[PDB]
A paper describes a structure:
Geranyl-CoA carboxylase (GCC) activity was first purified from a Pseudomonas organism grown with either the related acyclic monoterpenoid citronellol or geranic acid as the sole carbon source. GCC also possesses 3-methylcrotonyl-CoA carboxylase (MCC) activity, and 3-methylcrotonyl-CoA is an intermediate in the complete catabolism of citronellol and geranic acid. GCC and MCC are members of the biotin-dependent carboxylase superfamily.
We first determined the structure of Pseudomonas aeruginosa GCC (PaGCC) β subunit at 2.4 Å resolution. The structure confirms our hypothesis, showing that GCCβ has the same connectivity between its N and C domains as that of MCCβ. The overall structures of the two subunits are similar, with root mean squared distance of 1.2 Å for 464 equivalent Cα atoms between them, consistent with their strong sequence conservation. The overall structures of the two β6 hexamers are similar to each other as well, with root mean squared distance of 1.3 Å for 2,866 equivalent Cα atoms. In addition, the C-terminal segment of GCCβ (residues 526–538) contacts the N domain, while that of MCCβ contacts the C domain. There is a large, mostly hydrophobic pocket at the bottom of the active site in GCC that can accommodate the larger geranyl group. Interestingly, the side chain of Phe191 in MCCβ is located in this pocket and clashes with the second isopentenyl group of geranyl-CoA. The equivalent residue in GCC is Gly162.
Numbering used by the authors:
A (entry chain B): 2 to 81, 89 to 216, 223 to 274, 278 to 461, 469 to 538
B (entry chain F): 52 to 81, 89 to 147, 152 to 216, 223 to 274, 278 to 461, 469 to 538
C (entry chain D), D (entry chain D): 2 to 81, 89 to 216, 223 to 274, 278 to 461, 471 to 538
C-alpha cells in the first residue's frame, strides 16, 4: 500500500523545483516581514502611551508554545495588508479559539473592504468549527473612501455576532482603545467585554452641539460602572489580556466534549519543496505530494482504472481517516462521475474530504459533451455543495475555471482553504483566454492585432492568477509553506473532529446585556 | 422566436400579480443585471421567475449580476419558491469567477432542499453558464437555438450544433429532459412542468376592512428628501386595515414608534422612526420584537432615521448596549421581517432597523428615500478633522460648505437599489398591496413542508 | 398537452383486443365466483347454527355502497384458495379499515403457507397505510398437513399484531367461532375482542388427563365474565358485527386528520379492454393506457428523446399528481438512468409513482454492458427501493426477470400491486428459456429441437397471471376498466396515511 | 447471592449426560466438516485457476485469532447445505463485520430457497447490528430447479442492499468469479466493488443474435475501465481480499463510537455438557445452566415464589447485566404474567434479555383458561415483541408450540438465536400429537394403538435440532460449552450497535 516515489533528491529537476518554490516562499514571507517592519514604526508612539503593540498583546494572550495558525495575513494587499486584523486559531487557556486583534500599529487600525470580507470569513470559521472568539480591539474604523462598498454589507458582521451568541459560542472582547461609531456595536454584541482604564473609548459620535471629554462620553470607567456596557475594567493592556485568559479559563468548555497512535510518512515533508515542477506546464503525479503527507505514505487508490486524470483515494493523516481528490489531467465525464461517487461514499463513512487542486478544468470536445460532461460535472458539484463532512482544500497548482468550483474552491464553502505560493487561480489559463478573444474577433482583421490581443490577454490573465492575488482577494484563507502541509492538515482535522463532537447551549436571542 | 419579456408575458398567468425585483440593479455601475426577475404565478403556482435580458447588450453577468442571482436564490430558498428560469446569455470574469461559484453551490442546495428548478435554454449557455441548466432539475431545450457546452467551438473543429445542440443534449447526452420546437413551445412546456407538480396540495387549508382614506392619492405624504422627523403614523394610517393601529410603549419613547396593525387580515408589528433611536427606543424595540416572536407576529420596519442618539446622556443611559440588544433581536428573531425604506437610513440605524445586512426577508425603497453611511453634515466634519489635527476658514469651513451638499444631494435611492441595498424601488402608493403580497408569501412558506434529499436530484 | 390516441375505436384489432381481454377477465372472475359457490354450499350448516356466512358478516360490517377493494382473492389457488381469508379495504362507519373475515364456509376456515403469507401481507398493508384492522375470526387451527412445517414462521403474524398495537393502529376482533391452540392469540393480541355467545371458543388446548365441555374450557361467557379476555359479549353474528361497527364508530379516528376539482379523461375507460393487442408478442404504446386513466388525458412526457423504450411522465388521476413509468421496449442503460432520475424528481416534489409493467427486462450485449447497464439498473433499483413517496404497481403485460425488480415488483415493496389478467410474470419468456437450456447443456443429437420448445411450453404455466396472484406476487387481479378508480382509491389511502398522526406506546395495549 | 449446584461433578448421571451431549455435538460437528470436505474436493480446480478456496479467502480476510461466529452453517441441510454461503461475524482490520463468501467449491456457489432465506437473515443481522457487510462473491446464478419459483421474492435481497446503503452501513464486495443475470445486482448494489482480473464476470446475459467473449461482455477489466461498475481491480483472489481489508481499514468506523472488570463463574463452563439429563423427558433446574454462564455464578431470582415453573432473574455475563428467562415446567397464567413484568423491568433498566428455551408450552385445563392464560400469554408476547433491549435466545431443550413464541423463538425476531444440539423444536411432542390425532378422528377398530404412536415417531423427525437449524429456525447449533463466550460476544455486538451513530442518505450511494 505504500507509494513508491520516483523523485530524485540529488538531481537537476528536484534542485530547480526546490529553487523555484523556495523563491516563492521567501517571496511571500518577505511581503509578510514588510508589514511587520511597518508596525515597528508605531512602537515608540505606542510606548509613549504605555501601550503594547497588537502582536505583543497576542503573545501575552496566547498559551506559550501552543500551535497558532494565522489566517489571511496578506488579505487586501494592494487593493486600496492583512485587512487591518491579525487573526488565527490557537489556544488561550487550553481552549482552542478564534483569536483576533485590530492591527492598530498600521494606519491606527482602519478596516478595508477586504477587512469586511476577512471579518465575515473569520466569523464563518468560528461558527462552523464552534470556536470561542477572542478579540483584542483597538481600531480606527473603516476607510472613509469605502463607505459605500461596505456600509450596508457591514451590518452582516453584526448580524453574525448576534447569531454566534444564540448559537452558544462565546465572544470575549478586550477593548484596548477606540471603538467608535458603528464599530462600538462590535464590543456591544460580544458576551464578555473588557475595557482598559483611560486607554479605551466607545461611543457612536465622538466629541467633534455638546462639549465633552472623551472619557466622559464613552471612556472605560464610564462603561464599567455607569452604563454597564462592559464586565471588567482593566488597568493597562497586559491586565486586559490577563482577564481575557481568566474568562476563557473559567468556562467549562473542554469539559463539554466526550472523551476520545500513527506512523509518520515514509518520505520527509522537506521534500515537498521539489515535488512540483518548476516548469509549470510539466505534468506530475499528485501522489508524490500524497506520499509525503500520508501516514506510512499509504494511499488506497479509488477507481483509478476507470479514470486516471481525477485521482481519488483514502489515507490517514495523524490517525484521521480522509478521502482525497486530486488532479493529474482535465476532469473528464468519467472523472466527475467517479468523484461524485467518491464524495458520497466518504459522506457515508463520515470521512472528511481533502481536495488538492491542480486543475485545469473539464475536458472539452464533442466526445466529452456527448458522454455527459455537463451532467456528470453537475453531480460532482452537487456532491461537493451538499456533503456535510468537513472539506479541506489545498491549492497546490492550478485552480482554473469550473475545475475551481468542482474541486471545492472558496465559493463551494470548504471548511478551510489554503494555497501553495506556486499556485494559480483564474477563470482560465491565459493562453486559452487570449486564444478565444482572437477567434471571436477573427470574425465579428489585421494579423498583428490578433497576435497582440491573444498574447497580451494571456500574460494579463496569467499575471493575475498568482497566489498573491488569490490570497489578497480572500480566495483562500492564506499561503502556506508546502513543508507545513501535513501538520496543517493534522491541525485542521483535529479542529473539525472536535467541532463534530461538541454540543452547544443555544438560546433564542443571544445573551442579553441588561 | 420571442423576446425576454414576451416569453414572460406568455409564461405568467394572465392578470395574476407579478412583483418584479431589482429592476435597476447595477444602474450606473457598468442595468437590471442581465435578468428580468420576479415573483408571480404559473399554472396557479407562485414561483421565482427569471429571464435573461439579451436585448440590453446580450444580458451579461457581472458584479451586480452575481449579487442579483445570489439574492434571488436567497429569496427562493427562504420563501420556498420554485425557480423558473428562461436563459440565453467576459469583461468582469477573471475577478468575479471564484465568488461566482456560489450561484452554482446554491443551485445544488436548493435542489437538496426540495425546491425544484425549471430551466428553459433558449440560446447559448457556455463554459460556467452551462452549469446553471446543469444544476437545474428540469431542463427544456429549444430545437436549433439552444446550445450548451463547457467550451463552444471558439484543437477540435466542431459546429456548435454538433458540439452542444438541443438535439445532442435531449437525445445523446441526456442533459435535458425536454426538446421544444421554438421559444413559445419551451415556455409552454415550462408552464406544464410547473402545473404538473402537487405544490399547492402540500399546503394546509385556510376578510378585513380596508383603510379609511383612499390609498390612491399618496404621492403627496412625504416631503422631497426624508431626514425630517415627519410622521410614520401617517403611513401606518394609510396601510393599516381600517387605519387601526395600537401604539406600543409610545409614552416611554416617542421617536422610535412601535405597534400592531392588521394588513389584509395579516397581523403584524411595526417598528418606525420619527427621530433618532435613543437608548429607550432601542430597549423598547428589542422588547417589542421579542413579543412579536412570542405571538408569531411578522415585523415591519419603516426606515426613516439618521442613527442612534448621541451625547453623554445616551452613552450613560446605555445606547450601545440597548442598540446591541435591538440588533440581537432583529438578527435572531425567526418571524418574517419586512422592510420599507420610507426616508432616511443612516449608519447603525439602517442596521438596527433591519436593513440589507440584517437579511430582512424582503426590503423595498421609496424613490424619495436616502440610504447612506452618514450625512453630508458629518462628512465634511470628518474630512476636515482627519486633515486638520491628524488654522483658517480657507480649509476648515470651506470643506463642510462643500462636502455637506455633495452627499446631502447625491445620496440617491438609485445608488442603493443599484448596489442591491434593497430589492427595488416601489411607488409609495403601492405599499399596502405590496406588503399584503409579501405577508402572504411569508405565511405560505411558514406552512409549507418540503422534501429534502442528501445530494440534490441526480441527472444520471 | 393531451394524448391523441390512434387505436381504432370502432376498430377490428380493438374489438379483437377487447374480446380477448374480456375473455381473460371472465376467466378469473369466473374463478372468483367458484370460491363463493363452494362457500355457499354451507348455507344450511350456518343457517342451522344461526350464523351469517363470512360474506354476509362482511356485507353487514361494511358501509352502504362505499368502495371495497378485495385483496388476494385467488391466493394459493392451487398449492394445497383465497387463503381461507376474505379481506380488503373498505369503510366501517366512515372509517377506512383493513377488513378481514375467516372463510369458515370453506374447509372450515383454516390456514396454510399461503394463509400465513396472505396474513403477513395484510398486516404490512395496514401498518404502511395506517388502517384499523377489523377481523371476523372463525378458524380452529391450521392445516395439520403443514402445521409442523410452518408454526415457527407463523409466530410473525403474532409479532406483527403486538407491534401494530404499539404503533397505535387499533385491532378489532369478533370471534364468531373457534380460535384455539396458537390461534387463540389472534384475538389475544387484538385490542378489542367481541365474543359471540354459544358459537365461539378460545383455548390453548381443547378437551383432547382432565375432562371438560369446550364451553367450560373457553366459551364466550367464560372469557367475557371470568377470565376477561373479551370486552364485549354479542348474542349472534349480526350482533357481533354490530358491536364491531360501534367500536369503530366511537373512535375519533377521522378527527385526527387535517382538512383538505378534476377533469375526466377525454377517452372512456371502457376502451382499456381493447388497448392491449390480443397477440401479446405484438408491441403497443403505453401512452394508450395512460390516455384513459389520466385527467384530461393529459400527460407530460419526460426525457422521451433520450430513450423512448422506458417511458416516464407526469399526470393527474382524480386530481392526484403522479409520475408514471412504463415499458415500450427493454430497459437500456439510458432508460434506467432516466427512470432513476425520474424517481428522484418525484421524491423531490413528493409526487407518487405509478409503475405500469410491460417489460421483458434489460437490453443485452457488449454495448449495453459497456454503457453501464448494471450500474444504471442498480441506481434505478436504489431509487425504487429507497423512495419515500407511495409506489403503485399495475402489471399490465410482461413483467420478466430483472425488469420485474426495476419496475417495483413484489420484492421491492410497492405499496400496492395489482395485475391485469393478461399479465405474465416469470423469470423469463419460455422461448428465451428453452434455447438457453439447449445451448448451455448442448456443449457441456436429436434432443435439441424438442427439449428446447418443450421447456418453453411449460414455462408458460409458471407465467399466467393466475400463477402470479396465487403466489401472492400481486395483491389481486383487476378488470382493466377499474384501473382509474382503483388508482384513485389507492392514492387517497396513501395520502390519508401520509397525513395521519398516531399515538404510539411502548408494549401495546395490555389486556390486564 | 451465588447459586449452589447439586449436580454431582464426579457423578454418573453427570458423566452420562456429559457423554450423550458430546455425542450430539460430535454429530453436528461431524456434519459441519463433511460440508468442508465436499468443498475441499475442488482444491485442484481452484488451484489450477489460481484461486483460493472460499475458506482460504475468509481466513485471509479475517483478523488473526479474533473471534469469528459462523452463522447457519447447516442451513438447508436436506431440502434440495449451508446455503451455498459461508458467513459470520468477525473482525476485518479491527472492525466487526458481517462477513460472507459464496461457497463456490460446492455445486459452484448457487442459491436456492434456503439460500434466499439465509441471505435475508444475514441482511437483517447486519441492519439491526450495524455491521459493515463484506461479501466474497462467486456464484453464476440460482438453482434452475427453483429460479422461476423464487425470482420474485429474491428481489427482497436487492431491496435490502439498497436500503442498507441508505442506512449508512457500507457493503464491500469482492467479485472472484461470475455474478451474472439477476445476481449482477449483488455487486451492483454494493458500495465498494473489487473485481479480480481474468476470474470475474458480470453481465445480465452471458453469450447465450450477437456473439461475444464473456470477457468482452463483462470481465473485470471491462467493468473497471469502461463501464465503471467496479472501484478496484485486483490481480488475484489474495489481492482482492487484500483490497477488501484496506477498504475496511480506511473507514473511520470505530472512531464513531464513544469510549467505555468481572468475576468468572465459580463452576467451570465445561460442566455444561453434563447438566442436561441424557434422558430429555427427565426434568432439570435451569439454574444449573445459569451457574456456569453467570459471573461469580451469581443470580438474583425474580418472583420465584409466585411461580417456580417460569424462572426469571438477573445476572452478569462478562460484566454485562442481563435478565434471563427459563423453563422448569409449562407456562402458567402466573408465569406469563411474571415474565411479561420481568421483560418490562428489563426494558426500564435497559437490561438485555436471555431466553433459555426448555418449554413444553402453556398450562392447560379449565383452571388455566379461567385464570387468564391467553390474556397473560398475550401480554408476554407483546412484551417480547415490543421490547427495545436486545433479546438473545439459547434453545437449550424443548421449544414446543406457543411456548416457542412466548420465549422469543424465530418469529418474534430475537436478535440472535442459537440452539444446543439436544434441542428440539416442534409444534408439539410426538406423543401429544398421536393421541390427539387418534381421539379427534376416532369419533368423527384396531387403527388406534398403532396410528397413534406411529405419528409420534415421525414427529420426532421434524423435531431434532438438525431439522430446526436447516429450516433457519435458529442462526446455528453451538457446543454448550461455548454458551458463555457466545453470549459475551453477542452482548458486545448489541452494545456497540446501540451506541453507534450512522450517516443515513436518501437513495443509497450512487455508482454514477
Amino acid at each position: 500500500p505504500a507509494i513508491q516515489s520516483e523523485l530524485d533528491v540529488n538531481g537537476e529537476d528536484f534542485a530547480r523545483n526546490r529553487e523555484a518554490m523556495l523563491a516563492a516562499v521567501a517571496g511571500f514571507r518577505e511581503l509578510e516581514q514588510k508589514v511587520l517592519d511597518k508596525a515597528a514604526e508605531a512602537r515608540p508612539k505606542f510606548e509613549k502611551r504605555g501601550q503594547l503593540l497588537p502582536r505583543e498583546r497576542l503573545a501575552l494572550l496566547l498559551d506559550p508554545g501552543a500551535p497558532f495558525l494565522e489566517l489571511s495575513s496578506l488579505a487586501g494587499y494592494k487593493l486600496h495588508a492583512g485587512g487591518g486584523i491579525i487573526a488565527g486559531i490557537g489556544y488561550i487557556a487550553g481552549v482552542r479559539c478564534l483569536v483576533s486583534a485590530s492591527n492598530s500599529a498600521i494606519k491606527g487600525g482602519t478596516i478595508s473592504p477586504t477587512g469586511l470580507k476577512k471579518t465575515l470569513r473569520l466569523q464563518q470559521i468560528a461558527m462552523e468549527n464552534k470556536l470561542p472568539v477572542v478579540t483584542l480591539t483597538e481600531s480606527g474604523g473603516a476607510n472613509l473612501n469605502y463607505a459605500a462598498e461596505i456600509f450596508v454589507e457591514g451590518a452582516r458582521g453584526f448580524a453574525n455576532q448576534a447569531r454566534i451568541s444564540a448559537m452558544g459560542i462565546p465572544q470575549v472582547t478586550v477593548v484596548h482603545g477606540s471603538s467608535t461609531a458603528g464599530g462600538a456595536y462590535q464590543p456591544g454584541l460580544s458576551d464578555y467585554v473588557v475595557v482598559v482604564r483611560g486607554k479605551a473609548k466607545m461611543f457612536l459620535a465622538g466629541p467633534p452641539g455638546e462639549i465633552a471629554s472623551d472619557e466622559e462620553l464613552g471612556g472605560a470607567e464610564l462603561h464599567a460602572q455607569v452604563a454597564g456596557t462592559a464586565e471588567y475594567l482593566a488597568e493597562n493592556d497586559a491586565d486586559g489580556v490577563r482577564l481575557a485568559r481568566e474568562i476563557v479559563g473559567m468556562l467549562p468548555w473542554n469539559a463539554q466534549l466526550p472523551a476520545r497512535s500513527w506512523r509518520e510518512p515514509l518520505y520527509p515533508v522537506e521534500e515537498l519543496l521539489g515535488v512540483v515542477p518548476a516548469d509549470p506546464k510539466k505534468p506530475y503525479d499528485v501522489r508524490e505530494i500524497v506520499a509525503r503527507i500520508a501516514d506510512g505514505s499509504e494511499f488506497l487508490d479509488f477507481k483509478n482504472e476507470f479514470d486516471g486524470q481525477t485521482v481519488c483515494g483514502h489515507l490517514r493523516i495523524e490517525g484521521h481517516a480522509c478521502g482525497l481528490i486530486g488532479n493529474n489531467g482535465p476532469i473528464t465525464p468519467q472523472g466527475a462521475a467517479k468523484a461524485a461517487q467518491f464524495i458520497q461514499l466518504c459522506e457515508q463513512s463520515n470521512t472528511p474530504l481533502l481536495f488538492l487542486h491542480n486543475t485545469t478544468g473539464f475536458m472539452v470536445g464533442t466526445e466529452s459533451e456527448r458522454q455527459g460532461v455537463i451532467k456528470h460535472g453537475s453531480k460532482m458539484i452537487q456532491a461537493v455543495a451538499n456533503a456535510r463532512v468537513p472539506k479541506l482544500t489545498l491549492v497546490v497548482g492550478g485552480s482554473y475555471g469550473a475545475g475551481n468550483y468542482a474541486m471545492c474552491g472558496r465559493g463551494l464553502d470548504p471548511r478551510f482553504i489554503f494555497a501553495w505560493p506556486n499556485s494559480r487561480t483564474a477563470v482560465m489559463g491565459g493562453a486559452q483566454a487570449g486564444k478565444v478573444l482572437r477567434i471571436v474577433t477573427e470574425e465579428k482583421a489585421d494579423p498583428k492585432m490578433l497576435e497582440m490581443l491573444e498574447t497580451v490577454t494571456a500574460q494579463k490573465l496569467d499575471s493575475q492568477s498568482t497566489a498573491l492575488y488569490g490570497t489578497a482577494s480572500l480566495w483562500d484563507d492564506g499561503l502556506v509553506d508546502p513543508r507545513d502541509s501535513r501538520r496543517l492538515l493534522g491541525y485542521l482535522l483535529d479542529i473539525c473532529a472536535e467541532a463534530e463532537a461538541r454540543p452547544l447551549k443555544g438560546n433564542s436571542f443571544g445573551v442579553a446585556r441588561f
